[PDB]
Design a protein around this nucleic acid. Structure first.
Ligand code: DDS
Ligand code: MG
Ligand code: MG
Ligand code: MG
Ligand code: NA
Length: 538
DNA sequence: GACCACGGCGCA
DNA sequence: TGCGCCGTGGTC
């Protein structure tokens, strides 16, 4: 059992933080284990210097805290990553111990011993799983070191800008609230959907379309209000009000208060075992849902800036998941569109409408996007009729016309579900698996929900695999050029480069990303450079 | 002060 | 399709 600090080489680490965010955490305890023998650090911060590598459960979090302290402690093996590859429903140390053995406690020594035991257990289970092993060695394990650097680096925020924006938005919010109260004939809490439901459907007697899932209230969702956009002018004002309060409560107000005292920057967490499909997620705060789609929303992006003397480089894969779908399905028409360098959404609109290529306006292109994404998500003709604001039968017609233009997409969905029923799981191009139960359920709604999850995963997950692999390849090149990787948003990366290097970094990053893994179609990357995230989008 | 479920909505 | 965070309403 016990033995004196320091631990031997290759030992597994255990640690306890005062809070979940490693950039903010006090390191309460540090221990290590090897051969079941546990070493406990008398003083954790000092002991941190004695480690060569962070090897154990949640290795990346310890590495981030180390980098914060000025120490170069790279994360190595982590049983969480092995478990996540075996089955992406394995998302937490608590859950992994419960499933495979042992107990996740709040004591660093026990956590270190548990890390060692779970590693041996899960490594053995991956014996012979060559494609999952490749993902571990070539994507996930090296990716964790990249993520550690991204987290510790953080991103600079224009706090003064957001403070000013806050005053501006507040004035607009107050104006709209007054108008809404005027139309309703009395004040209420406009932020309470319960109070709004009564006002709209009981007091003003507007027709109530949909109901909410768990409790069966009359919905006030944007989708419901959209269809009432003329049944009363109060609805227009409510939707405007909601857009602004969303921006204010979620981004404008909270973000400026999260600037770190040492770095003077904002630090997110990139969670590596958090999704069913192999995507990353981001939290504390989430920087993967910064507004960008509307003019009002875009203003938030201006707040994300480069260090003095640096620039942001923003790179995004064009129509990434549709290119992946083209590769997986082998559809000749999809592949041809991308091969010919044509715009997939415009080619789709030309076919979905009266054509030709040149006659496709901005409205039609936006409609084609909606149809295309619908296909990816298996969205219903009802949902599509809502989004497009067209009759139900017209949305039905569009979905059928889609599969006429891209027939092998339908065949691919069927092949994917056929094999999924047989094997109990589906997989990405590189062999990342998701176990999807209920593919043969006897209740149609349950079965069909499982089907949509199952055929989407190889697309979403292959795209995630390719992005992760691109990050692993790109990081070392950026290091050699004195540049930094800051953010990933699924199909997009944001880098930071000294001004004099930015052009060279952008050129190299584009080539690394486009060439990450050749497919039946080219991967195209759009790149922009600017002093802020909005202006960088070029 | 802290926890939660729900409806709702931001991004991919 | 996949996420994480918001305020409200409720609770301990
Ligand atoms: N309104 C929406 N609904 C569902 N998914 C959406 C979406 N908007 C985006 N996504 C998802 C799906 C795609 C991904 C990125 O959105 P891009 O805007 O970049 O769509 P892209 O295919 O590249 O078309 P392009 O940019 O040339 O107009 O996020
Ligand atoms: Mg795009
Ligand atoms: Mg984007
Ligand atoms: Mg929820
Ligand atoms: Na239901």
């Amino acid at each position: 059992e016990e033995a004196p600090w320091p631990p031997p080489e290759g030992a597994f680490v255990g640690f306890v933080l005062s809070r979940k965010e490693p950039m903010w955490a006090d390191l309460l305890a540090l221990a290590a284990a090897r051969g079941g023998r546990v070493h406990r650090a008398p003083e954790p911060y000092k002991a941190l210097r004695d480690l060569k590598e962070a090897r154990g459960l949640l290795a990346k979090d310890l590495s981030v805290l180390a980098l914060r302290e000025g120490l170069g402690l790279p994360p190595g093996d982590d049983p969480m990553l092995l478990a996540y590859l075996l089955d992406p429903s394995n998302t937490t140390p608590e859950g992994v111990a419960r499933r495979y053995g042992g107990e996740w406690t709040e004591e660093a020594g026990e956590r270190a011993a548990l890390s060692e035991r779970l590693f041996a257990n899960l490594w053995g289970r991956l014996e012979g799983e060559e494609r999952l092993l490749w993902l571990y060695r070539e994507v996930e394990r090296p990716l964790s070191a990249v993520l550690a650097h991204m987290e510790a680096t953080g991103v600079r925020l224009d706090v003064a800008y957001l403070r000013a924006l806050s005053l501006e938005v507040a004035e607009e919010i107050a104006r709209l609230e007054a108008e809404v109260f005027r139309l309703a004939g009395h004040p209420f809490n406009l932020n309470s959907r319960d109070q709004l439901e009564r006002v709209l459907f009981d007091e003003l007697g507007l027709p109530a379309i949909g109901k909410t899932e768990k409790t069966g209230k009359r919905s006030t969702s944007a989708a419901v209000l959209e269809a009432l956009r003329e049944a009363h002018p109060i609805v227009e004002k409510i939707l405007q009000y909601r857009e602004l309060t969303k921006l204010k409560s979620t981004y404008i107000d909270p973000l400026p208060d999260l600037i770190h005292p040492r770095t003077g920057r904002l630090h997110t967490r990139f969670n590596q075992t958090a999704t069913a499909t192999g995507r990353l997620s981001s939290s504390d705060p989430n920087l993967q849902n910064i507004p960008v789609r509307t003019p009002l929303g875009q203003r938030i992006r201006r707040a994300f800036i480069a260090e003095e003397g640096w620039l942001l480089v923003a790179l995004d894969y064009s129509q990434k998941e549709l290119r992946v779908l083209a590769h997986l399905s082998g559809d000749e028409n999809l592949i041809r569109v991308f091969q010919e360098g044509r715009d997939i959404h415009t080619e789709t609109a030309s076919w979905m409408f009266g054509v030709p290529r040149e006659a496709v306006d901005p409205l039609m292109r936006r409609a084609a996007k909606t149809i295309n994404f619908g296909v990816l998500y298996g969205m219903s003709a009802h949902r599509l009729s809502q989004e497009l604001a067209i009759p139900y039968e017209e949305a039905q017609a569009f979905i059928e016309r889609y599969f006429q233009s891209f027939p092998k997409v339908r065949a691919w969905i069927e092949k994917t579900l056929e094999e999924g029923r047989r094997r109990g799981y589906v997989e990405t191009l590189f062999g990342r698996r998701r176990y999807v139960p209920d593919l043969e359920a006897r209740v149609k709604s349950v079965r069909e929900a499982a089907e949509r999850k199952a055929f989407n995963m190889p697309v979403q997950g292959t795209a995630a695999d390719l992005m992760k692999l691109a990050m692993v390849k790109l990081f070392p090149r950026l290091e050699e050029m004195g540049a930094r990787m800051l953010l990933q948003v699924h199909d997009e990366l944001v880098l930071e480069a000294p001004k004099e290097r930015a052009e060279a970094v952008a050129r190299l990053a584009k080539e690394v990303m486009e060439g990450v893994y050749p497919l039946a179609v080219p991967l195209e990357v759009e790149v922009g450079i600017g002093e802020d995230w909005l202006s960088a989008k070029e």
